[PDB]
Amino acid sequence: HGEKSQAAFMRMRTIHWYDLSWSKEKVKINETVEIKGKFHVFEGWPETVDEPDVAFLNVGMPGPVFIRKESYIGGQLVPRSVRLEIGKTYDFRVVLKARRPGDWHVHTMMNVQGGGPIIGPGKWITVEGSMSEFRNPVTTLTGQTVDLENYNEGNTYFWHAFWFAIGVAWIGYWSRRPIFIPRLLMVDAGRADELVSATDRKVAMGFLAATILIVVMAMSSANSKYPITIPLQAGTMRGMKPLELPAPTVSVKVEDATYRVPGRAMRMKLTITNHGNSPIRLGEFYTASVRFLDSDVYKDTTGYPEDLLAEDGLSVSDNSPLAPGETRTVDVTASDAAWEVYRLSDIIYDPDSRFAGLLFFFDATGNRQVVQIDAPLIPSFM
Amino acid sequence: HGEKSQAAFMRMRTIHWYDLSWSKEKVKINETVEIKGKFHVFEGWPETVDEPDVAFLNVGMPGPVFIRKESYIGGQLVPRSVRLEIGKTYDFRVVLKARRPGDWHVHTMMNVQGGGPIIGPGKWITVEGSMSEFRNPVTTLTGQTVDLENYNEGNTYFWHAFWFAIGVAWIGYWSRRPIFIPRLLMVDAGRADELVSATDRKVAMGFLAATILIVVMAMSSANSKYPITIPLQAGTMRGMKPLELPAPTVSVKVEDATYRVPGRAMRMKLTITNHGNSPIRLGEFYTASVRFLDSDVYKDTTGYPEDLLAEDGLSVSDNSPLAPGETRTVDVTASDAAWEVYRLSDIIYDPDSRFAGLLFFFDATGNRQVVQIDAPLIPSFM
Amino acid sequence: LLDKKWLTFALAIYTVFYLWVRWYEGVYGWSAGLDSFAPEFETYWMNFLYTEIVLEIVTASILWGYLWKTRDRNLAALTPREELRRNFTHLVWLVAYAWAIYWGASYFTEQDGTWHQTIVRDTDFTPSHIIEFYLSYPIYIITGFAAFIYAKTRLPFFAKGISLPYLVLVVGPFMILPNVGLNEWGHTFWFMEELFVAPLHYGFVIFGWLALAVMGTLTQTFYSFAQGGLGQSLCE
Ligand SMILES: CCCCCCCCCCCC(=O)OC[C@H](COP(=O)(O)OCC[N+](C)(C)C)OC(=O)CCCCCCCCCCC
Ligand SMILES: CCCCCCCCCC(=O)OC[C@H](COP(=O)(O)OCC[N+](C)(C)C)OC(=O)CCCCCCCCC
Ligand SMILES: CCCCCCCCCC(=O)OC[C@H](COP(=O)(O)OCC[N+](C)(C)C)OC(=O)CCCCCCCCC
Ligand SMILES: CCCCCC(=O)OC[C@H](COP(=O)(O)OCC[N+](C)(C)C)OC(=O)CCCCC
Ligand SMILES: CCCCCC(=O)OC[C@H](COP(=O)(O)OCC[N+](C)(C)C)OC(=O)CCCCC
Ligand SMILES: CCCCCCCCCC
Ligand SMILES: CCCCCCCCCC
Ligand SMILES: CCCCCCCCCC
Ligand SMILES: [Cu+2]
Ligand SMILES: [Cu+2]
Ligand SMILES: [Cu+2]
């Protein structure tokens, strides 16, 4: 929801999300929904974004309407920040448990230490039920099961109220007598030495001694109970296992890419060389969370968000099968209302008019090839 | 021209320029001269120089005696800073258009973000004609052709003169009356409240309102004209394509390298092992823009700058052909007046007495091998 | 007589000398002045540096010593008319100081900006700095010290004490000259760049601020002008 505001070129060349899937579109309270997919870290990572040496797999959502039960990069849990390598592809999986009823736009996002939020595609997920039914049980290594919704809440309230009461008692003890104007006049007109006299000093000594003694006793009591404690577990996690993708058999060279100002279409001329041993056909162009599809070649069945999906938004001048070894140059047009709705056309405002994206090539059998393209994006006005 | 001042070891181990070529040595005004070549980023990059994560392909010259029409690293234009990888070799090409008559020493240089200028070999290029004949036309995406020499000059002059005139009018309006001593005496001796009276306040209100209104109107007028504008295009460019050099079939191990203080010669003992299937011979030693050649093995035909070229400056103790599989140890002496002219002998002043360079090995057929050597450089006094 | 034609000479000497200096650096900027280890660099810019430093030291010594030796011993028996004449002469000195400050701190300082932005810094003693750090800065320092000494030795208002604003106005801009040590250190060790706004240049900035003491100096000279011959007319 915070996207459509970030720079178009920055959204185009940071992280490309694809093969996204959602286990459910509509869930009950306490029910789990799983979000899977892959993200590729673009090689032309903008210099204004710090390299993803410290990155966190986050979820874009309006507060804890879901709780993040688990999150994985590769196949291992990532509750801490992780190190990503530029040019690598990683698979991810986030498990969410529904907590608050409503219709929520859930994004998978990557927060980068010195670059800010990189928001992936967002999907509307409906939660039904009551928040009062939500439970978040955890079992500790000390053998007790607690609900994270209300665990320690009473203790927190008690201690805060107790210390607030002590402070209020101190202030009220001094506030029984007149406060401001008579005391000011006594201090000014001559030596005061009369508004602070025993047993005021005795009360202050009692307050100080009781405060120190109560702090010490409470610490000792909180040590006898909960004798086993550990510090907060933190630290960036290295060694994220990237995907071992095969080298693509399709090479694409971008010769000029243009978009009309104003307009809802982006045009580029590609020289595609087909290696391997099967006829290929261009089926998809993904630029920034927006999938332009050639409906005659590929159809989306993963329930991709409709406002981000252009079913027939990709038109290839010659999308006939490309025989192996053959090289041809085609004009590719990616047109959809999403290009203006998600403010991809506002790259004219950007100080770096370069685009990046993913091309998906499909053969007759159905297996697909992912090739990455990047080029300057030249506006056209006349 | 700014070299011969930098530290000798820093010039030796940053960037090695070779295969340099110049399309022309003498040009007319508006004529193009192209500079080509390769540079290798040395593996032992000094720690005092920041890694070439942000580098700019620049031209060393006395101001815009040429204009940089184009510059390429790999095969793609690089008008912005680029990222280089240590240990990689890149090919470059700079196109220059002559602008100012004279004899100019043109260097190809690489500016590194946290290290400063790395100046390559410089060549004297003669420009003849008149600066008044120079034209720098560009065609905008709005369909107008302008000359960059004088475009917007009149508008700039007009606006600056207009605002200067407004300020001068304000000052002169207040300067018609006496300025310093009577006003100072009036302010000091009693309340002043007499040197600022209507219609002075009315004139000031008029000045303020006119200033704001003129700024707003001028901005709107400059918006109606030039309705299409883009911000400055900036940002380091990643993904520079390095050269795909074959692995050298020659391995060289440097056993001690010495230079006499004072002297114009550098001596080193190399153990050369010839792999592959052809007899090789040492033909060149390049250390810092200085090419020491063994004239019996290789001759320069690219018009390398004479003061940087030692045609017979390389003497090998046994420069007979090295049969494949054979290993031999030879004493190599690189001697030329350039070693002292370019202050390569002033490495004795440096806090890091290590050298680096390139050895060029040639077989009978004429094909060449580039091997990189680096070692401590020990001065000898007795 | 009062204000005489010494003001014309004060303007003209700086104007002519600095126009000739600009012509010299235009002729020998490139071509004996680009390569600091070239032999003609020594005869066209190192010799310039040596000669200008020697002449600056000699001129400063002679001028300051003469002004101090010819100091007015009997300042009490100075008539208001001669005091007005001396106030005008001191104002001429201040005009010369302002002109020299302009030439040093604006013209040749930004001129060194352009030079160092268009060429590769080759030495600590480039043609631009020879003209800026070691000619124009010493010249305005000499002029400012001379103006201060003249005020102290001829004007009773500026006698019987060291005026704090005048001392700041004269010494602060002087501190820009030893600040060159930070400039050279900050260009060779810090900041392998040619950023003109680098913090290595804040030494010039801070001590360039001290020239704002000209405001206190000038109100002091106004009071010195308006001592006996303040009028009448003024406030009358
Ligand atoms: C506050 C006290 C300041 C003291 C410092 C003053 C510095 C003076 C210049 C140093 C020159 C130097 O050092 O160089 C000496 C130069 C080197 O040029 P050359 O190779 O002989 O070529 C031929 C000479 N041309 C290139 C000038 C034609 O030759 C000279 O003899 C001539 C120097 C003339 C200086 C006097 C004229 C100044 C303009 C007129 C208004 C005053
Ligand atoms: C290129 C070198 C030029 C040097 C010129 C120096 C001239 C001599 C300085 C001097 O004494 O002042 C000259 C004038 C007029 O002041 P005088 O009346 O001569 O001062 C003496 C006063 N006394 C009779 C009561 C003893 O007072 C002035 O206002 C002179 C200003 C001249 C311009 C500043 C030049 C300084 C260069 C470092
Ligand atoms: C380099 C940085 C300067 C540091 C700043 C310190 C000076 C600031 C205060 C100042 O200028 O006062 C010194 C006198 C003014 O008179 P007084 O300070 O009252 O003392 C006069 C007797 N004295 C000349 C020996 C000093 O002024 C003079 O008498 C100066 C003229 C005599 C010096 C001439 C010889 C110098 C040749 C190089
Ligand atoms: C208030 C500061 C004035 C600075 C003017 C200046 O730098 O002049 C040098 C420049 C040099 O350009 P140009 O006149 O073409 O003569 C070239 C001669 N060289 C190359 C030696 C400067 O132009 C002039 O000499 C005009 C004279 C202005 C008198 C106030
Ligand atoms: C009043 C503001 C001062 C801010 C100082 C500043 O901008 O410093 C930038 C610099 C950061 O260096 P950077 O800009 O990256 O320099 C790049 C070029 N090299 C690496 C050659 C220095 O930080 C420092 O080294 C400490 C400065 C201390 C000031 C009292
Ligand atoms: C001056 C008060 C110091 C209190 C120290 C208490 C130490 C208790 C150790 C558990
Ligand atoms: C107080 C003056 C504010 C001026 C605002 C002008 C807005 C014009 C929009 C083009
Ligand atoms: C590399 C970070 C440099 C930070 C400099 C801070 C300067 C603050 C001056 C008070
Ligand atoms: Cu959203
Ligand atoms: Cu990608
Ligand atoms: Cu040069």
Ligand SMILES: [Cu+2]
């Ligand atoms: Cu190298």
